[PDB]
Symmetry: C3
Subunit: 525 residues, 3 copies
C-alpha cells in the first residue's frame, strides 16, 4: 500500500514521478562504485563502472523443419502418406501411376515451399510496425532475429510487396490440401514474432528456418525425394529478400519439373475441389502485423530442447533429406557430429553433451492434459551412437525423436553503446551471445577453457521464459559427494519426462499433424 509512504497527495506526485526515459535499445546507464588497491590488480582505470548495455532485444530460434523422426513402414509419416493416397485414388478410375510415397513426397514439397513464402510475408508485414519505445524494432530486429537485410528491403519494398502477391497467386494454384493440420502450425510459427510480456519494451523471440527443401526425382535411385540445403545462416551474412525469392522460384519450378508430380496435382483437384486446397492470402495496402503475446508459445520455448546443447563446441548435421525405399516407406532422420572448437576434425579433451530424462515446467498450478500436449513438442531427444570414444574420433549422433520444429541453436542480442565515435556507424554495435542449454559449474563465456563448454553471458535472464538451463556439477562441487545436475529457469510447477516417454509423445503428436483418415468415413465434392 503506497498510501503509507505518502505524506501528501502532492509531495508524492512530486518526487516519485521518476522518468522511464530509457527506450529499449538505449543503454542502461547503471553504475557500480568500487574500491581496490591499484597495486594488486592487473590494470583497471577508474573506480566507477558506468553501464553501457541495452536491455536484450530478443532471441533467434534457428530451427530445422521437421516431419517427425521416421524410419519405419509404421513411423506415422508413412502411415499418413498411405492414408492420404487412399483418399485420392479412392474414387479415381485411372491406373496405378505412382505409389503412396511418390504422392506424399510432392505434397510436402509444396508445404515446405510455403514455409519460405510465409517467412517472406512476415518480413514484409512487420516492416510497418514501429513503436516509439523500442528503437530495436523496425531495423535491428530484422537483421538479427530474422536475418533479413533491412536496408535492402526498405529500398525496394513496393517491388517485393507486389512480387509476394504474385507468388501467392502462383502457390494457390499448387495442389496442397487445406486440411493438413501441420500447415496451420508452420504458418503460425513463421508468420509472427512473440513477446515475452504484454509490454512492448520487453524482449521477444522469433522462429527462423535453418534451411529449405527442394524436390528432385534425379537425386536418389530409389525415387523422388526432398533434399535439404542449409540456409547460409549461422551468423554469417544477414541475407536480403532478393535471394529469398530466387530460392522459392527454384523450389516451385522444381516441383513443376516432374511430369509425374503434375499428373498428381490433377488427381488431387479431382478428389478435393476448388476449395479443398490451401490458400495463402495476399497483402493489402495497409496491412501491418503485430508482435503477439502467446503464452502457449513461450511455454513451448521454456520447455524445448536445443540440439546444439552448448555453443562451446562445433556441430554438424547431414542426411537431412527425405527418401523412400521399396515404394511404400518414407525416410528422414538427421544425423550430426560433435567436435572441439580447435580441431574441427577431432574431439580431443572436450566433452560431448545431450540431455535425456528432462524437466517440464508449467506456469499454471493445475496443468491439464491439453496444456501438456501443446507445451511439449519443441523438445527433442538426441542419442549417441557408440558407447565410448577416443580423442582421435568424432562423437557421432542420431535424433531419436522431436517435434515439428526442432530447435538447432539459439542466440540473443543486445546493443552496446560507444560515446567516443571513431566513426558514426560504429557507435552502436549490435552483439550476440550464444545460449547453451547444457553447461558446467564454473564455466566462462570464453570458448577458451572449461572442457570446451561455455557458460552463459548472465544477461540472458532478461528473457522471462527462457529454456531450462541444465548445469552439471562434479561430485566435488556437490554437497553430497555424488555428482548431479542443477536446474535453471523460472520454475513454478515442474515435473520430469523420460527419454522414452518423450519419444512416445512426438511419435504420436507428429502423426496427429498429418492425420487424414477422419475424411474417410464421410465423402466431399
Amino acid at each position: 500500500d503506497w498510501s503509507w509512504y505518502a505524506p501528501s497527495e502532492l509531495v508524492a506526485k512530486q518526487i516519485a514521478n521518476v522518468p522511464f526515459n530509457v527506450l529499449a535499445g538505449t543503454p542502461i546507464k547503471a553504475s557500480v562504485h568500487l574500491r581496490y588497491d591499484p597495486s594488486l590488480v592487473s590494470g583497471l582505470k577508474d573506480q566507477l563502472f558506468v553501464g553501457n548495455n541495452a536491455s536484450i532485444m530478443g532471441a533467434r530460434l534457428l530451427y530445422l523443419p521437421s516431419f517427425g523422426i521416421s524410419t519405419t513402414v509404421l513411423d506415422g509419416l508413412s502411415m499418413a502418406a498411405n492414408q492420404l493416397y487412399a483418399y485420392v485414388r479412392k474414387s479415381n478410375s485411372g491406373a496405378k501411376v505412382y505409389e503412396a510415397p511418390d504422392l506424399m513426397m510432392t505434397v510436402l514439397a509444396i508445404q515446405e515451399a510455403y514455409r519460405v513464402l510465409f517467412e517472406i510475408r512476415r518480413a514484409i508485414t512487420f516492416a510497418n510496425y514501429w513503436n516509439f519505445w523500442n528503437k530495436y524494432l523496425p531495423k535491428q530486429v530484422f537483421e538479427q532475429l530474422l536475418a533479413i537485410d533491412f536496408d535492402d528491403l526498405m529500398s525496394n519494398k513496393a517491388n517485393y510487396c507486389a512480387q509476394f502477391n504474385l507468388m501467392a497467386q502462383k502457390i494457390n494454384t499448387f495442389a496442397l490440401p487445406k486440411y493438413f493440420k501441420s500447415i496451420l502450425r508452420m504458418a503460425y510459427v513463421s508468420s509472427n514474432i512473440f513477446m515475452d510480456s504484454d509490454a512492448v519494451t520487453g524482449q521477444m523471440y522469433a522462429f527462423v528456418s535453418s534451411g529449405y527443401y527442394r524436390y528432385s526425382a534425379t537425386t536418389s535411385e530409389s525415387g523422388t525425394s526432398l533434399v535439404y540445403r542449409d540456409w547460409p545462416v549461422g551468423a554469417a551474412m544477414p541475407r536480403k529478400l532478393n535471394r529469398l525469392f530466387t530460392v522459392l522460384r527454384e523450389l516451385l519450378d522444381a516441383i513443376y519439373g516432374d511430369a509425374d508430380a503434375q499428373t498428381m496435382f490433377g488427381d488431387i483437384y479431382k478428389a478435393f475441389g476448388s476449395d479443398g486446397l490451401y490458400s495463402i492470402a495476399e497483402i493489402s495496402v495497409d496491412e501491418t502485423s503485430t508482435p503477439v503475446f502467446d503464452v502457449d508459445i513461450l511455454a513451448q520455448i521454456e520447455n524445448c530442447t536445443i540440439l546444439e546443447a552448448n555453443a562451446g563446441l562445433a556441430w554438424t548435421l547431414d542426411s537431412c533429406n527425405v527418401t523412400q525405399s521399396k515404394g511404400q516407406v518414407l525416410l528422414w532422420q538427421p544425423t550430426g557430429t560433435i567436435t572441439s572448437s580447435d580441431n574441427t576434425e577431432h574431439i580431443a579433451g572436450d566433452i560431448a553433451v545431450a540431455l535425456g530424462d528432462r524437466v517440464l515446467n508449467s506456469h499454471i498450478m493445475e496443468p491439464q492434459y491439453s496444456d501438456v500436449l501443446e507445451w511439449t513438442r519443441l523438445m527433442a531427444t538426441i542419442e549417441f551412437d557408440k558407447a565410448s570414444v577416443t580423442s582421435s574420433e568424432k562423437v557421432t549422433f542420431k535424433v531419436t525423436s522431436c517435434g515439428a520444429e526442432l530447435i538447432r541453436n539459439v542466440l540473443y542480442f543486445k546493443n552496446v553503446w560507444n560515446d567516443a565515435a571513431e566513426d558514426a556507424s560504429q557507435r552502436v554495435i549490435t552483439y550476440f551471445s550464444h545460449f547453451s542449454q547444457i553447461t558446467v559449474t564454473n564455466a566462462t563465456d570464453d570458448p577458451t577453457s572449461a572442457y570446451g563448454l561455455m557458460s552463459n553471458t548472465l544477461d540472458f535472464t532478461q528473457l522471462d521464459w527462457h529454456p531450462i538451463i541444465y548445469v552439471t556439477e562434479t561430485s566435488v562441487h556437490n554437497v553430497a559427494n555424488l555428482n548431479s545436475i542443477l536446474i535453471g529457469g523460472d520454475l513454478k510447477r515442474p515435473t520430469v519426462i523420460t527419454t522414452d516417454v518423450v519419444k512416445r509423445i512426438n511419435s504420436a503428436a507428429n502423426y496427429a499433424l498429418y492425420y487424414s483418415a477422419n475424411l474417410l468415413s464421410n465423402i466431399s465434392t
Copy 2:
C-alpha cells in the same frame, strides 16, 4: 497499351494452365517475365504516370 496488357495479365493464374502466368509472356507477347515479376510495382506506377502524360496529348 501492349504495356498495360503486360502488367494486367501478370495477375491471371489458373490451376489448369501452367503455361499462363510465365511461358505465355515469354513466347506469345515476347516480354521478360522473370524481369517483370522482380519489378512490377515500379512498372505499374510508371504506367499510371505515363497514362497521365499521354492523356495530355491532343
Copy 3:
C-alpha cells in the same frame, strides 16, 4: 518532436508546395529549395552537442536523384539516435507531452496528388 512548435508549420508549408504567380496554370511558378541540411554530432566541437551544415551539392551542378536524398535522411536520423543522451531526452519528452503532444507527418495515399497553389 513536439507538435506545438509554430516554426514547423512554416517549414512544412514552404517545402511542401509550389506557388503560382497567377490563378492561371500557364503562368510561371516559384519553388523553395533547401541549399543543404543539418546533422547532429556530439563529437564535432568540444563545447558539446551541435548541428553541422553540409552543403547540398546544389548550385546548378548535377540535378540530384531521390536515391541520394533518402540515404542522407537515414544518416540524419541514425545520427540523432547515436547519442545515448539524446534518447534519454526523447524519453523525458513523451513523459511531458504525450502520445499526441508530438508532431506527425502523414503517409501518402494511392491517389494522392497535390496541386500548385
